[PDB]
């Protein structure tokens, strides 16, 4: 691995990479951060504590022009795996947590491509606030949300957007939580009806506020009432 | 951000984040303290503790972190990791679980005049003595006592945040309303020491009324 | 023990843990993975989580961490902190609510030939579809999917150490009997 040792030394030592500084030519510019969310599994929804526990893989994508190289000058290397603490990160956190765990669980390596694109897919176990509507329990449906923003950066420094996918050479936004049809195991009590994703911008807040922008991934989940039916309702009603 | 890099290099040359900013001996650092309540998580009567999610709002001046924007490409403000600058050791004194500090240090916003605004998040479990006499048709008076753990009033002076509203801020749209508790009052007060080692406090009070529908239906 | 000190100083003078440990970047790092199941801690049917105690044996050759024992007083093997070297980033893909990767960074046994053996412990909380149809006479089939999170097969290759998991040091369970076990 001579060649990527040369490339890492070229990027970080020769060009003097500074991860404290954002990847921008001027301060007034904003860094575009594209976010997607994959739901590995819905762990639980505790009604008494009103807490949604989820396992999510967060796909971050941005551009760092300082981390560009010509592939044929470096042995046709097209991608690098780097520890996330060498490079600048757009520190996204779960704003609406209810346990103090704002950050991702496992800080995996970033993937850096020769054309300057930084890809990062940290997984996380999140415990979020989900107020519970008990009106139709056990025939109820709940509307939980995972709100993602940056407390270290505002809309003046990073611009949050949704991931973009392609089909028939046509680009579209990914406006939903990604679920693998084969690898996903459904929760034993909750069935996902809707799973949208939205970029919410508050026009009232100033542009230098962390509360201006966020990306929210919603889970509309219907309870499967067979357990409660069989074990409570039929005995109680009879 | 080469200009920002030079500005940070200038600001942090010879800077010691463990040293309180005082241009002269005897100068007091005025720290304005305010609170935003993101969520009243719970009030556990068995443990006698109020669980809340908040954003602190700490404002103070550090003369060492001042610069002329004209000499630095018109940069009027910076966002800096909180561990890099001096912080006042403002903690929740009446925590119940032994956790004094904030949940995430995040970043301070430093203006060119030396003003520093820090808004860390915090998940706090504070002690609250439950008045059990009228439970579940009761109201409780749960306080969050914030103060410097080490510095005395001759070194760090506290004041209630405003700019004058002496209250806990609750954002109307984004507040997670508790299903069992209604916030009646939410003032904030500056408590002076009795009559160094003396220390002021900023106490944020939450007077909260229980909503007893569950106990009416079930008991 | 001065020979070992000199060797350890020599090895990590021009070492990088970011860089993959083979001679050419077009080569693939060959990692042998084995799983030892020490204890089946618990099966949670509600949240569908199997929690187990495991040792995740990982073996691979580091091209740059080689030496001649004759040059170092006959030292043929040493123990090195795992944080100091490149490692494969094995992740439990079907983790339910536990740790995704190894968090207990124990020491690695390094031979003079560059072969590294690293056997960290872990508590795996894995998501297992629980079929309650025949409960309490139910048979379950719970899996542990392991893979390099950020490295694909063209840069890092993982192979099983054995066809079956290592159950030699398995504690008896008061609730379950492992009839069959197999790694693919």
């Amino acid at each position, epitope marked *: 691995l001579n060649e990527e040792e040369r490339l890492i030394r070229h990027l970080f030592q020769e060009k003097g990479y500074n991860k404290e500084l954002r990847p921008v030519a001027h301060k007034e510019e904003s860094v575009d951060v594209a976010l997607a969310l994959t739901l590995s599994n819905l762990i639980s929804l505790k009604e008494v504590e009103e807490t949604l526990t989820t396992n999510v893989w967060i796909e971050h994508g941005w551009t760092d022009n300082r981390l560009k190289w010509n592939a044929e000058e470096f042995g046709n290397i097209s991608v690098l795996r780097l520890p996330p603490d060498m490079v600048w990160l757009p520190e996204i956190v779960l704003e609406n947590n209810n346990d103090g765990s704002f950050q991702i669980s496992y800080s995996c390596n970033v993937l850096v491509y020769h054309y300057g694109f930084v890809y990062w897919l940290p997984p996380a176990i999140f415990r979020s606030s989900c107020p519970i509507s008990v009106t139709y329990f056990p025939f109820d449906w709940q509307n939980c949300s995972l709100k993602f923003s940056s407390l270290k950066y505002t809309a003046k420094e990073i611009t949050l957007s949704l991931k973009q996918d392609a089909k028939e050479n046509r680009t579209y936004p990914v406006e939903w939580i990604i679920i693998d049809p084969e690898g996903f195991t459904e929760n034993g009590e909750w069935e996902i009806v809707h799973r949208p994703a939205r970029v919410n911008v508050d026009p009232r807040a100033p542009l230098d506020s962390p509360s201006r922008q966020d990306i929210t991934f919603y889970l509309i989940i219907r309870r499967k009432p067979l357990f409660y039916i069989i074990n409570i309702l039929v005995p109680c009603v009879l | 951000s080469e200009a920002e890099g030079r500005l940070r290099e200038k600001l942090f040359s010879g800077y010691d984040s463990s040293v309180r900013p005082a241009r002269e001996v005897g100068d007091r650092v005025r720290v304005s303290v305010g609170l935003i309540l993101a969520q009243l998580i719970s009030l556990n009567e068995k443990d006698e503790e109020m669980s809340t999610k908040v954003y602190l709002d700490l404002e103070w001046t550090d003369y060492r972190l001042s610069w002329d924007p004209a000499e630095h490409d018109g940069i009027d403000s910076l966002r800096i990791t909180a561990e890099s600058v001096w912080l006042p050791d403002v903690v929740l004194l009446n925590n119940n679980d032994g956790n004094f500090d904030v949940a995430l240090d995040i970043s301070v916003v430093v203006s060119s005049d030396g003003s520093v605004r820090w808004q860390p998040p915090g998940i706090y479990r504070s002690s609250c003595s439950i008045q059990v006499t009228y439970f579940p048709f009761d109201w409780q008076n749960c306080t969050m006592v914030f103060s410097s753990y080490s510095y005395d009033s001759s070194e760090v002076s506290l004041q209630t945040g405003l700019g004058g509203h002496q209250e806990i801020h609750i954002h109307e749209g984004t507040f997670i309303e508790n299903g069992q508790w209604e916030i009646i009052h939410k003032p904030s007060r500056l408590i002076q020491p009795p009559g160094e080692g003396q220390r002021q406090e900023v106490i944020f009070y939450l007077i909260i009324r229980r909503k007893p529908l569950f106990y009416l239906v079930n008991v | 023990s001065e020979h070992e000190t000199r060797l350890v100083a020599k090895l990590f003078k*021009d070492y990088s843990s970011v860089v993959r440990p083979v001679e050419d970047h077009r080569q693939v790092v060959e990692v042998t993975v084995g799983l030892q199941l020490i204890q089946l801690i618990n099966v949670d049917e509600v949240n569908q989580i199997v929690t187990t105690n495991v040792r995740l044996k990982q073996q691979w050759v580091d091209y740059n961490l080689k030496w001649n024992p004759d040059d170092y007083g006959g030292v043929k093997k040493i123990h090195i902190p795992s944080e100091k070297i490149w490692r494969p980033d094995l992740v439990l893909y079907n983790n339910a609510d536990g740790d995704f990767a190894i968090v207990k960074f124990t020491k690695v046994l390094l031979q003079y030939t560059g072969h590294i053996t690293w056997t960290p412990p872990a508590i795996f909380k894995s998501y297992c579809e629980i079929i309650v149809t025949h409960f309490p006479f139910d048979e379950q089939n719970c899996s542990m999917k392991l893979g390099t999170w950020t490295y694909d097969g063209s840069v890092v290759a993982i192979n099983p150490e054995s066809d079956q998991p290592d159950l030699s040091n398995f504690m008896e369970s008061g609730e379950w009997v492992i009839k069959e076990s197999r790694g693919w």
Partner: antibody
Amino acid sequence: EVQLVESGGGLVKPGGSLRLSCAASGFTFSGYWMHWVRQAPGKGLVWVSHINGDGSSTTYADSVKGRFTISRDNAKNTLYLQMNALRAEDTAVYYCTRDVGSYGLESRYLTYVNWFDPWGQGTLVTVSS
Amino acid sequence: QMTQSPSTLSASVGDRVTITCRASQSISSWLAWFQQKPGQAPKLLIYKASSLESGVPSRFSGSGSGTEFSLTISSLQPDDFATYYCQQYNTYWTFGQGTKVEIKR
């Protein structure tokens, strides 16, 4: 573009003193070790001295161990070399150069290499009586 | 200590050149190769004994480890006639006595 410009040379009598200066531009001056390297007329390159990024650590050649003093000012982006007890054997073109391999060594992922990549045009010092 | 060879080397355009360097003690890979044309400053060609600089032509190559190292020019060009130096680092920096490449006639 990375640039190093030297100055402060000329004719000095033996036993005197001189101050060589090197102005840097195009990179973070404080983040790199810096070296002074002399080339006598019609001879090869000879390393004079080395200074850390902050300036805590300094190193000198055996022939200039007690007579030279390397220093730096990161605010002005200026490397300096004070020379004392000059002799006729110190007549040379002096070069200031940046050690690229010393950047980011506080991180555990980067180790040092000798990578004197950018060199200034140099400045001539003539020690003669 | 450093020993370069040959002190002088005559060749023409298109010929292969190999300049050898020898250390009295094992310096592992801490070696750089520099080029210096007359009247100019040194230019680093290789660092760590095999790593080409970003802007250097690919004809230049570097090999060697421990004590024996070498610089190879596959095809000489008019701009490659210069004095080639080597430098090592064990605990201080030591340059080796240079070697000059001249046009052969």
